[PDB]
Amino acid sequence: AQGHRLYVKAKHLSFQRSKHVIHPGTSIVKIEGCDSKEEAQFYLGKRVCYVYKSSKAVRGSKIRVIWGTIARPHGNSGAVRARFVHNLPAKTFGSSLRVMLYPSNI
Amino acid sequence: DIYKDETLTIPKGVTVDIKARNVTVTGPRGTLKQNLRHVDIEMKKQGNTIKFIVWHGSRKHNACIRSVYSIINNMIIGVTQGFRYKMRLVYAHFPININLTENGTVVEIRNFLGERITRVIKCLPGVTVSISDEIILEGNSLENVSQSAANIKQICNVRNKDIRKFLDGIYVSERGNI
Amino acid sequence: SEFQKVVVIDAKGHLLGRLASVVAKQLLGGQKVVVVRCEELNISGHFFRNKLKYLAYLRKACRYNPSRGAFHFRAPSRIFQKAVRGMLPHKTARGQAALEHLQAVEGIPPPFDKQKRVVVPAALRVLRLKPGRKYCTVGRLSSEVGWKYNDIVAKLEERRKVKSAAFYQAKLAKQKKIASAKEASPVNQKLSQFGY
Amino acid sequence: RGKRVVVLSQLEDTLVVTGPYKVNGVPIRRVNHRYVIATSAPKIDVSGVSVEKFTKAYFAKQKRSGPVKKDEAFFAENAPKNALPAERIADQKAVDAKLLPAIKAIPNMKEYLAASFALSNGDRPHLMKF
Amino acid sequence: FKRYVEVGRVVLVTKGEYTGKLAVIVDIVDHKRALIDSPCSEFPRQVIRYGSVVLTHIVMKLPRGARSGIVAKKWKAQDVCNKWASSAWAKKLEAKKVRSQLNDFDRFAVMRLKKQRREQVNVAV
Amino acid sequence: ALKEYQVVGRKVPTEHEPVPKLFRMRLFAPNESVAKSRYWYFLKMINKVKKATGEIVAINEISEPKPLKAKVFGIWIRYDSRSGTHNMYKEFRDTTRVGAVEAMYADMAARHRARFRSIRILKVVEVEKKEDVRNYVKQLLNPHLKFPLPHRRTGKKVFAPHRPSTF
RNA sequence: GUAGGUCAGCAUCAGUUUUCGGGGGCGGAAAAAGAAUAAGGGAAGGUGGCUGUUUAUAGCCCUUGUUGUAAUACGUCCACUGGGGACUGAGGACUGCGGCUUGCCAAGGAUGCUGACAUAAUGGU
RNA sequence: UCUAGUGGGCCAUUUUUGGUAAGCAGAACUGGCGAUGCGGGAUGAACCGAACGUGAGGUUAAGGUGCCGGAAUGUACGCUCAUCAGACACCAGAAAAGGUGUUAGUUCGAACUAGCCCUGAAAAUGGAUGGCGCUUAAGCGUACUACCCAUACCUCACCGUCUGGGUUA
RNA sequence: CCAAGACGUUGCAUUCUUCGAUGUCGGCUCUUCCUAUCAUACCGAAUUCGGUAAGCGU
RNA sequence: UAUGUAUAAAAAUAGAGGUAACUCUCCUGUAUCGUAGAAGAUGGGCGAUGGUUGAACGGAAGUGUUUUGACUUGUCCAUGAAAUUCCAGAAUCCAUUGCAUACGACUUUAA
């Protein structure tokens, strides 16, 4: 079954925020194996998505997706900032995201 | 300093192995297993010599090197010749009665200062008690022999009386080897 | 670096706060964490100081209905969960969901003694304390503040260790055979230019 | 996705590319250059294959200019059986004939093109080179 | 012990722009700093801290404060190059570097070759 | 990152002083601006010169002639404390005067909680004879120096699979 | 053919910005060093030799010459240049200031090439 | 020119008077609060930073980056072990004098001299460096990078106000 | 703290809230906390003076 | 909420771990196990005699561990894919009891 997964696993950590004020427009994402801002530069501009499952069949699909793009690195520990077409729900803190390898430049 | 070292020569003792800093010194007389986890000292065994070394230690940490050398010599002496303490009873009017049970590991003291209470003390392992009013404490561990003497002396204590007149008690007289 | 579905952590030789800080962050990251051998955790500082700290904690109680006031858990795993709870936002629905993602246990129970146990070098005592500094064990601290299962935990632990030792020898016997057959294949030295 | 293909020519924006249809079954298609990871594998000789007839007009779809579409018969239409011109099949066979000898000559590349790329546990694409 | 910070010990640099290089402790500045030198041109003589190097098992006979030319002469004479490589530690490090330099086609070749290797699993009953 | 600066200056000429004297100072400062400030600080306490009525006639950055050679530096300082009645002599072993002053500032702040403003450097001298040398510096000068590597805590690499060897 | 709904992808640009890389000029003790190679001086935390000594069967320190218009680091500058990502597209014939060679142009604010869906898909409550 | 409201103020910096002292009474200069949100100091009318049209992007201030909590369990050198340590200005409090505690200094082993720790130190519901916890720190002193983010700064869009320039086609 | 337990020295009224009202002594009753300890326990000196100590009683 | 849902010695850290007083390893997992095939088709030739899958042990929470018809990418070869033509049988009530009881509840009894 290990002939798939053209994406890199990532986790939605939190919104971009100060101590008390949150900014849900842009999110903080931890990409696995990305441990520095120098490594985050490779993942800049990649296409990240949140995949979740619903009971209602939209166009005959149980799976629906919210797309987004990695915008910039965040901090020193490899976390990145991500902008989505729909702001990610606050219930996804700790949920997983798929970071594709496109738009590719490697 | 960077390098503070003391050198000791080992006798004909059989095993002095230091696994996990635990010296399981086995000699002609017996086995003494003690830990040196309380000192952060590189002691190296080569040939028939052992070097206790401290690197980058301050004065407080360097002070324990001689203590380690003293104690390592102590159970070397214990496993080679052993330790014997001769301890005499002193009483003015009431004789002190002492009984030894199961080869002396329990000592029962009665008629101390005329009291009717029996004081029973369990000696530490590796120490045996014999009656020479002289009590002989012989064993491998100087730690255990000295502690057993301390327990007996503390137990036979005079309470609420003038020590200036009441000189009754048990005090150690001689500390030597077998 | 990489998240596993469930991570089992051997708490032996770890510091309470440093490991709790790492565990709490991992739990908030959506990761399921199991911590075994919580009785083998360490708290920096000598035993009596830590004994005084817990006894001070014990005094905290309501004057009306002490059954309402702070509940003082004497188990080493429950002391660890207390540290993680204080490091989590547990009044919040996110923090609660993190708390049920943590399972801290004394010893290594049978669902976990057959699983790999990782360690956290950011919390290991040998890496994190200056040598010669005094420290205490949570298990001993627990046993002298009210925990009454220190003996049975120990006795079950050597039985597990004996079984684990038997498992290891069986696996090492297998690895000896596979290693011997490894160099017999000429391809092992053929793929030397590839770094393997 | 995950297929390995051999680049034929660079079109105006995308790459006219096909993994040999007799190897991995990927026909001649345009692929945008941002959706490919170029590999460091040994090059395949594509100098002997004609690439002038692979143009935007060649790959162009049929114009619709109306909102009416979709049908079960519509899906029964198209398909490889229908729609697919014989000239398109001939071009695919011709490029296959001109491309297979090179991948036959260089070892392990035929089956490499047949395989499918995938990421595994612990693989970090920023550290990995292709 | 087997690794002592002393004049002439060969060290492996682990942090900085010279990570992975070999050098020799020409002189000891203090408990935290030491002057090292390497025969290679890309590694100049410099004062470095012990936190960025790991002590190797190799010790060479070198007089304290030796210049770069003399250090290179002693390095060649005692043949420390390929004396470090003879150890399994260096072979493991070089294997890690070679394995990291692999590309996708080389990785596919590795997969097939080790798959050929794995298909034996023939052991005596 | 301190730097050693040769600062030469003089007061502006007047009718009373047509030819003023040139005074030079070696002083350690992060940049030329602070170097000129300290020069005026020392010249103001001694020899009746403001910054206004004086001028900096020369600025130079001095580098270590032998930055690859281990040396012993003896530094005399004036230490100002809560009591402020102190002179000190300390010795530091390293390859440059700038590093010795930097290590002095860190050591002085660590041991006595003294700040850059409180400390003024009387003189930094290179001690060449081993006999002229602090006990710790001498026992670093031991020809047979050797010691084990001290503890050094050895990407994110959380959740290590094996217990560390640490030896 | 013409123009046209919604939403995407890419290219070529403009505005704004972030992050990496290369090349070159110049400045300082016209860096300090160092290497290599000729003088002389001194010695050790004293090597071979025999505790004491002066390069020998290790070497080091100081000065000078040389290789030298040495390199590097640092500073500064280039109307020198290569990438990656992000946000924005206000205006609505023509004028203007410029570059090129009259047409062209990245020059007084986004267009071009496509695809999917024409849907509750976007959007709202 | 006509007219409104106001004619109880309060706090801070610094100077200063009455007072045993006071979250006390009284003044001087300035800045504030009152009338003012925002970032920060856990929390607070005057403290720190910054003063506010609706938004997008970028960057900072004060302050922070172990976890709660956005951001280095960063770098360098030390000091400290506290039997109820310490942890950031205002600020929410302790002194003399000692302490075979310890680390450095000064001058002729002795005295001194400093820095940290301990002692001096002592209450009443159970509870507060904000909490958890922290000991080659996640404590203290110094140095150097990277990072986080305000309604402040920068570019841009839009709203309004004001100001200036055109407009008989 | 000091040496000649002296001398010294260092420490443990205001009118801010309430006058569209907070019921204003003591006793009785009852529970809890504090230690600056009267008794009890256990130690240290020369019954007396001390240290740990608020468990228990007063 | 998965996308390979892969990995079980214990210990010390101023030491360990083996193989055979010996000697080798350590200096983390960027490692091993795995990974090829219409989301993985239909055949064939060599080679191997393996590989993956549909009674006993384990009580600490034993959710298991072990044991004893397919599927072949070990190695060669031949068809097929497309136009998805550029991202997407009990209890209770009713009754009864008084060891109980404000009322509930509790203790009994009742075919």
UniProtKB/Swiss-Prot annotation, chain C:
Cell compartment(s), UniProt: Cytoplasm
One cellular component term from this protein's GO annotations in UniProt: preribosome
Pfam families in UniProt: Ribosomal_L13
Modified residues (Phosphoserine): S192
Entry GO MF terms: mRNA binding; structural constituent of ribosome
Subunit structure: Component of the large ribosomal subunit (LSU). Mature yeast ribosomes consist of a small (40S) and a large (60S) subunit. The 40S small subunit contains 1 molecule of ribosomal RNA (18S rRNA) and at least 33 different proteins. The large 60S subunit contains 3 rRNA molecules (25S, 5.8S and 5S rRNA) and at least 46 different proteins.
Summary of the function given for this chain in its UniProt record: Component of the ribosome, a large ribonucleoprotein complex responsible for the synthesis of proteins in the cell. The small ribosomal subunit (SSU) binds messenger RNAs (mRNAs) and translates the encoded message by selecting cognate aminoacyl-transfer RNA (tRNA) molecules. The large subunit (LSU) contains the ribosomal catalytic site termed the peptidyl transferase center (PTC), which catalyzes the formation of peptide bonds, thereby polymerizing the amino acids delivered by tRNAs into a polypeptide chain.
The protein's name: Large ribosomal subunit protein uL13B
Organism of origin: Schizosaccharomyces pombe (strain 972 / ATCC 24843) (Fission yeast)
Gene: rpl1601
UniProtKB/Swiss-Prot annotation, chain D:
Protein name: Large ribosomal subunit protein eL6
Single GO BP term: cytoplasmic translation
Cellular compartments annotated: Cytoplasm; Nucleus; Nucleus, Nucleolus
Residues with Phosphoserine modification: S40, S50
Keyword Ribonucleoprotein among record annotations: yes
Function according to Swiss-Prot or TrEMBL: Component of the ribosome, a large ribonucleoprotein complex responsible for the synthesis of proteins in the cell. The small ribosomal subunit (SSU) binds messenger RNAs (mRNAs) and translates the encoded message by selecting cognate aminoacyl-transfer RNA (tRNA) molecules. The large subunit (LSU) contains the ribosomal catalytic site termed the peptidyl transferase center (PTC), which catalyzes the formation of peptide bonds, thereby polymerizing the amino acids delivered by tRNAs into a polypeptide chain.
Major subcellular location class: cytoplasm
Membership in a protein family: Belongs to the eukaryotic ribosomal protein eL6 family.
Quaternary structure annotation from Swiss-Prot or TrEMBL: Component of the large ribosomal subunit (LSU). Mature yeast ribosomes consist of a small (40S) and a large (60S) subunit. The 40S small subunit contains 1 molecule of ribosomal RNA (18S rRNA) and at least 33 different proteins. The large 60S subunit contains 3 rRNA molecules (25S, 5.8S and 5S rRNA) and at least 46 different proteins.
Keyword Glycoprotein in annotation: no
GO CC list: cytosol; cytosolic large ribosomal subunit; nucleolus; nucleus; preribosome
Organism per entry: Schizosaccharomyces pombe (strain 972 / ATCC 24843)
Keyword field: Cytoplasm, Nucleus, Phosphoprotein, Ribonucleoprotein, Ribosomal protein
Swiss-Prot record, chain E:
Keyword Cytoplasm in annotation: yes
Subcellular locations according to the entry: Cytoplasm; Nucleus
Keywords, ordered alphabetically: Cytoplasm, Nucleus, Ribonucleoprotein, Ribosomal protein
GO biological process, one term: ribosomal large subunit biogenesis
GO CC, one annotated term: cytosolic large ribosomal subunit
Chief localization: cytoplasm
Disulfide bond sites: none
Keyword Transmembrane listed: no
Gene3D superfamilies: 2.30.30.30, 6.10.250.2270
Gene Ontology MF annotations: RNA binding; structural constituent of ribosome
Stored Pfam families: KOW, Ribosomal_L14e
Function: Component of the ribosome, a large ribonucleoprotein complex responsible for the synthesis of proteins in the cell. The small ribosomal subunit (SSU) binds messenger RNAs (mRNAs) and translates the encoded message by selecting cognate aminoacyl-transfer RNA (tRNA) molecules. The large subunit (LSU) contains the ribosomal catalytic site termed the peptidyl transferase center (PTC), which catalyzes the formation of peptide bonds, thereby polymerizing the amino acids delivered by tRNAs into a polypeptide chain.
Homology family: Belongs to the eukaryotic ribosomal protein eL14 family.
Subunit structure: Component of the large ribosomal subunit (LSU). Mature yeast ribosomes consist of a small (40S) and a large (60S) subunit. The 40S small subunit contains 1 molecule of ribosomal RNA (18S rRNA) and at least 33 different proteins. The large 60S subunit contains 3 rRNA molecules (25S, 5.8S and 5S rRNA) and at least 46 different proteins.
Protein name as it appears in the record: Large ribosomal subunit protein eL14
Curated annotation (Swiss-Prot), chain F:
Keywords: Cytoplasm, Ribonucleoprotein, Ribosomal protein
Record's signal peptide: none
GO biological process, one term: cytoplasmic translation
Primary location class: cytoplasm
Cellular location(s): Cytoplasm
UniProt GO cellular component terms: cytosol; cytosolic large ribosomal subunit; preribosome
InterPro entries per record: Ribosomal_eL20, Ribosomal_eL20_dom, Ribosomal_eL20_eukaryotes
Molecular function via GO: structural constituent of ribosome
Cited function: Component of the ribosome, a large ribonucleoprotein complex responsible for the synthesis of proteins in the cell. The small ribosomal subunit (SSU) binds messenger RNAs (mRNAs) and translates the encoded message by selecting cognate aminoacyl-transfer RNA (tRNA) molecules. The large subunit (LSU) contains the ribosomal catalytic site termed the peptidyl transferase center (PTC), which catalyzes the formation of peptide bonds, thereby polymerizing the amino acids delivered by tRNAs into a polypeptide chain.
Family the entry assigns: Belongs to the eukaryotic ribosomal protein eL20 family.
HAMAP family according to UniProt: Ribosomal_eL20
Further remarks about this protein from its record: There are 2 genes for eL20 in S.pombe.
Protein name per UniProt: Large ribosomal subunit protein eL20A
Annotated source species: Schizosaccharomyces pombe (strain 972 / ATCC 24843)
